[PDB]
Amino acid sequence: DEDETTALVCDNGSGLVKAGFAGDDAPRAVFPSIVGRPRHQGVMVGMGQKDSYVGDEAQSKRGILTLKYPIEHGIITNWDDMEKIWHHTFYNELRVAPEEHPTLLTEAPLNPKANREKMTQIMFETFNVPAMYVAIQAVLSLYASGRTTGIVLDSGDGVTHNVPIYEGYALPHAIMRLDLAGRDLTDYLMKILTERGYSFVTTAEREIVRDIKEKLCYVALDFENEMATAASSSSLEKSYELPDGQVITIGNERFRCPETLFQPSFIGMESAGIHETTYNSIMKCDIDIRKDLYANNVMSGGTTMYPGIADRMQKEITALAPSTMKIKIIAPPERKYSVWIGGSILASLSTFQQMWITKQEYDEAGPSIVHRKCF
Amino acid sequence: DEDETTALVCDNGSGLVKAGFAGDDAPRAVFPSIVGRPRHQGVMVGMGQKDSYVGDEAQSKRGILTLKYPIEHGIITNWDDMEKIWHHTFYNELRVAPEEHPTLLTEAPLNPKANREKMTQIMFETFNVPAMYVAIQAVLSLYASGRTTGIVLDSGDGVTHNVPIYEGYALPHAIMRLDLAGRDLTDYLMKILTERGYSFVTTAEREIVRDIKEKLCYVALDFENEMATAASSSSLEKSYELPDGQVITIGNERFRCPETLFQPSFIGMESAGIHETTYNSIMKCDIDIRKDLYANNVMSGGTTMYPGIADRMQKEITALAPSTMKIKIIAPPERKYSVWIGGSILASLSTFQQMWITKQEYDEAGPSIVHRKCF
Amino acid sequence: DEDETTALVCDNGSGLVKAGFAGDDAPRAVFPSIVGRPRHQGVMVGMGQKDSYVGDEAQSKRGILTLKYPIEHGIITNWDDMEKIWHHTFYNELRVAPEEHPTLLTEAPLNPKANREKMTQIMFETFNVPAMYVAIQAVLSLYASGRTTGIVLDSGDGVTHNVPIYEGYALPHAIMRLDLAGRDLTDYLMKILTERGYSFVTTAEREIVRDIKEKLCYVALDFENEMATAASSSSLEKSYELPDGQVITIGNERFRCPETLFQPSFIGMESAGIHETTYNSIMKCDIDIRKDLYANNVMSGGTTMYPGIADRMQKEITALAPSTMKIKIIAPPERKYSVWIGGSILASLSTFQQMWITKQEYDEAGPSIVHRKCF
Amino acid sequence: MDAIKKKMQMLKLDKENALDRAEQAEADKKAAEDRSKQLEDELVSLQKKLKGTEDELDKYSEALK
Amino acid sequence: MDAIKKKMQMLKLDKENALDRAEQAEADKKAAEDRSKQLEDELVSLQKKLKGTEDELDKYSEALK
Ligand SMILES: Nc1ncnc2c1ncn2[C@@H]1O[C@H](COP(=O)(O)OP(=O)(O)O)[C@@H](O)[C@H]1O
Ligand SMILES: Nc1ncnc2c1ncn2[C@@H]1O[C@H](COP(=O)(O)OP(=O)(O)O)[C@@H](O)[C@H]1O
Ligand SMILES: Nc1ncnc2c1ncn2[C@@H]1O[C@H](COP(=O)(O)OP(=O)(O)O)[C@@H](O)[C@H]1O
Numbered sequence A, B, C: 001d002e003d004e005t006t007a008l009v010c011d012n013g014s015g016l017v018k019a020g021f022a023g024d025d026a027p028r029a030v031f032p033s034i035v036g037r038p039r040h041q042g043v044m045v046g047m048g049q050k051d052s053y054v055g056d057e058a059q060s061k062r063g064i065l066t067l068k069y070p071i072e073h074g075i076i077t078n079w080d081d082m083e084k085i086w087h088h089t090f091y092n093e094l095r096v097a098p099e100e101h102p103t104l105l106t107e108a109p110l111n112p113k114a115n116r117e118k119m120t121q122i123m124f125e126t127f128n129v130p131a132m133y134v135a136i137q138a139v140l141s142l143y144a145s146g147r148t149t150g151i152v153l154d155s156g157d158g159v160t161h162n163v164p165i166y167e168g169y170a171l172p173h174a175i176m177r178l179d180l181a182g183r184d185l186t187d188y189l190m191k192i193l194t195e196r197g198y199s200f201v202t203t204a205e206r207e208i209v210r211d212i213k214e215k216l217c218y219v220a221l222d223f224e225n226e227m228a229t230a231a232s233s234s235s236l237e238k239s240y241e242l243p244d245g246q247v248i249t250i251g252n253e254r255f256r257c258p259e260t261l262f263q264p265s266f267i268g269m270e271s272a273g274i275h276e277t278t279y280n281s282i283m284k285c286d287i288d289i290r291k292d293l294y295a296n297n298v299m300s301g302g303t304t305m306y307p308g309i310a311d312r313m314q315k316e317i318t319a320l321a322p323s324t325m326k327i328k329i330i331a332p333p334e335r336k337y338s339v340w341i342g343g344s345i346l347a348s349l350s351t352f353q354q355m356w357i358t359k360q361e362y363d364e365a366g367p368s369i370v371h372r373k374c375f
Numbered sequence D, E: 001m002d003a004i005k006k007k008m009q010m011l012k013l014d015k016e017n018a019l020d021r022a023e024q025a026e027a028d029k030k031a032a033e034d035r036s037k038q039l040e041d042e043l044v045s046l047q048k049k050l051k052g053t054e055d056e057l058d059k060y061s062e063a064l065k
């Protein structure tokens, strides 16, 4: 722990938890949001026999544990799970006590306010944090980009959000949430791999196939033409070496998996591709600034490490929108940490401690005070 | 052979093959999908000395043959085995030539597309069927029920599939396959009987114990209470007369065997009971029709001849789902033939020959034509 | 007897009984599980005229006694035989009274639950052991290896068991028992020696030929090529000096006897070689950890003193499984005592006396308490 | 008899050869993490340059538009 | 002699143990050349990005002029 009473910066992103100290450039403890529980009961002795397993421990013990998600698309299952994982993060991973450091947290867009009220109340009772602040990840990604104008595409693991912000002001009237995310990607890839001869249901293979998505997946420039040329495609077809050692070969599926977000009709969504969701979002607001929105679009999330989103994005928007002004996307490398960086940025300036949510305000007005203290 | 050129109707169900002519009420040649091969080499002469043994011949010659499964959970081992068994079915059992009769086949749900392309290609080259059509067994069981709304639980011998169909429309987004089936049932019963003092490994005893499952097995209304009262249970304990003549007595195991599908944690599955798989399947789709799904659930498969699935099904779904609307299951007697009946139904109407898969279409576009001709 | 009340550690392995005190490195009284009885009736006087003969006494008196096996492949013939042999072990061989020492016993994998209930009840009534614990020999061999990950091949004298355990958790769903063991080896060797001109039926020659298996037997690297070169093989052919003094010469049979476990079709088993049984066992469980199972396989049993199992094991598994990761077997010398060593290990720690099966628990709940006290 | 003597020699020699092989393999291991660390060093430096280049390019392009 | 049996056993087994630690080290060494390969790939791609950066900078430069 630093000698100074600097604040805690924790991004509880929908899919990854990244925690550390204020003034740091990158979060120190970063772990996926999976939680493992003993698949069977206790009869043995001498070691183990522990209920909750979180972090890399559960990653190593994936096979023996039922792998469960305490949060999915924002919905909260069991607050005890968050209690334990926050205990682990603060003491076993961050080696910090929350008594002496206020916490800045980031929440999923439209994370529920009622959800806010319960989580804040359990937090304040269970923990002894001196002060509090929670913010939407959209403005955090904006801060990471450091440009007040643009539309943020937050692609988490449970929801994809499109949020327009012009000159550093939020536009909730033109903000939308789409239920397509990593979960859907894994599902669709699971069914295609089932049609390829490999049919698995458990979560270990879920992580294997999301790793495959991280490594080999394409974003098709032209879809049906690329499957037409991918009929044989000995060179274009790509293989992976699974940890057991078998060589699993995939061809068109590499660019037929992310295409589900672009073409939701593959597995039955009324909503069109996410580019349509950015398009409608843009036109809902006044006409004039729309061009700037076209030229200032930002994309954020862990998924963004994949190739192909930028070219597809620009081409389709130019197809939909007039091609007079030039559209260009901006995306700094390793932007999944960017939100946490913005949290540090919030703690950088000396005005931030004017609106810390202190203990006594919550003791006076209950959780309801946040309704007036954040917004 | 009938004077008319009526079509062939063949259900290659995962566990049983049921073949016959169109317009018939029940399949004529019905045999299990086991295949026997000579356990040793040839030195004798005067009789036998034949490689492949299929059907009742192998059933009578179970002891002398290594009993192998050409298909398990949909996966295909050796196409030559299907070639021989189809030869046997068509000529030795159906006494029909496939030259003059188009074939309607049923396939296991979500079978590999590569599997379909290879099986169709070997079929068309090896055989001389004039025309083709293959369909999922789910809609076949639906046709047997004759009601366009409902969720089909297909319990084969390799996989159990839950498929929702509303107003005669498939919902692949809410369709799931579970690796629990007859094989698992036999395995679990094998280990329990091993704990009862009788330890066998060979397939003859596999068939004996599945026969025991057909005859004596219960589905426990309350599990731990019924083993508690089954401690002694002289009346409740039930016996079987094995063909060798020994009397083998089983008590709680009768209802502790099918319970494993409901309670997969007994032998270690992350997935919960099949009722949970029907529940999740239901909620994945829009809320409103879910009530109809509750009231229109159908179950199909040879296993369904056992008692206890209906009461357990309804009680647990009512426990999980609100108990306002009344849930009732429908299951016609001898429903394992029902799929084949639906095949006959398909050949009943005069529109079915509009989309026969003829030889020349396959000769033009290869196997790939089925990708556009069935779906 | 030690001044301290330390526990008894007894491995009743299927083929050998090894008993001693806790805290000791090796069992003190080790004897084969053969039991001799008077072949004829009593007319003489002055000496002998005793019914049961056990241990080295029966080994010396093999010729005069009908040699019978109180246990074969786990099945129990007569509990009186175990009563007498345990009396002999405790008082004539261990010189210990079971009144003042709790007993840790090891049982054959997947032994009958009824067998456990009857043996425990007769034990508790006949003997006055203060406390009890019985465990599967699989985890005992695991403890001897001291590594929580691996698949145990327990090759006893009645059954060969394959049991996978990952990170110190049992996997009964992937555990199998094969009826091939020492008995089969002796039988097959008996018939081959009959074809060599020497035809014996009695048990003395059974022990002679198992001694031959201990001394001279090979595990063929390539089978038919080695009989082809063993046609003459003056150097490769090996001889033994039988205690009567005749020189008995054996050639290819040295490596044609253990091969039968690998090639069961020689004497008619549907199950393939034990390497196939380890292979299927591995794939039954999740894909990912399978590589670790490949790299962490352990073999245990008295048979393991023979050469050739390791090389054959690795080569065939590498042939069956992809050869990316390196497979290596571990087998400490004199591992037939290893189980008993693990028993001592169990008594080493101070938590073991938390779950001793005391007399009063059995008096309260009968034998049924073990159903809740061990598992 | 004498063959067992040769055995003493060959077994010890093979053991020492294995020891030397293990030591050399470990040394090469350590050297390989050394080279990995230096490669990481220049990669990080060049990335830190790349970030500012990206920022200046975006602002310059906006000014051009 | 039995003592001879045990002697050869401990010596040969320690020999195999030493060789096996050699090859496990060699496996770590292989994973180290692997890590080095990915790091060099990333460095080369970053160099390409930087050169394209400078080219874009120049082009937009006299575009602005
Ligand atoms: N290094 C990486 N490369 C590619 N994809 C990644 C990487 N790390 C994480 N992801 C993907 O990002 C997803 C998690 O998104 P996350 O960054 O938590 O969203 P948010 O920005 O809302 O917190 C995971 O499902 C994973 O598939
Ligand atoms: N008369 C019967 N009574 C009870 N169970 C049966 C009967 N006939 C078959 N079965 C069971 O049905 C299983 C085969 O299922 P099957 O009907 O082939 O599935 P599908 O409907 O997918 O073809 C067998 O494993 C067998 O145990
Ligand atoms: N010193 C030895 N060398 C070779 N084989 C042996 C030796 N001692 C015992 N065996 C074999 O081991 C078998 C007994 O196996 P056992 O160790 O009792 O199995 P378990 O490990 O299940 O107790 C006997 O049939 C015998 O052939």
Ligand SMILES: [Mg+2]
Binding pocket: A013, A154, A155, A156, A157, A300, A301, A302
């Ligand atoms: Mg995100």
Ligand SMILES: [Mg+2]
Binding pocket: B013, B154, B155, B156, B157, B300, B301, B302
């Ligand atoms: Mg079925």
Ligand SMILES: [Mg+2]
Binding pocket: C013, C154, C155, C156, C157, C300, C301, C302
């Ligand atoms: Mg053994």
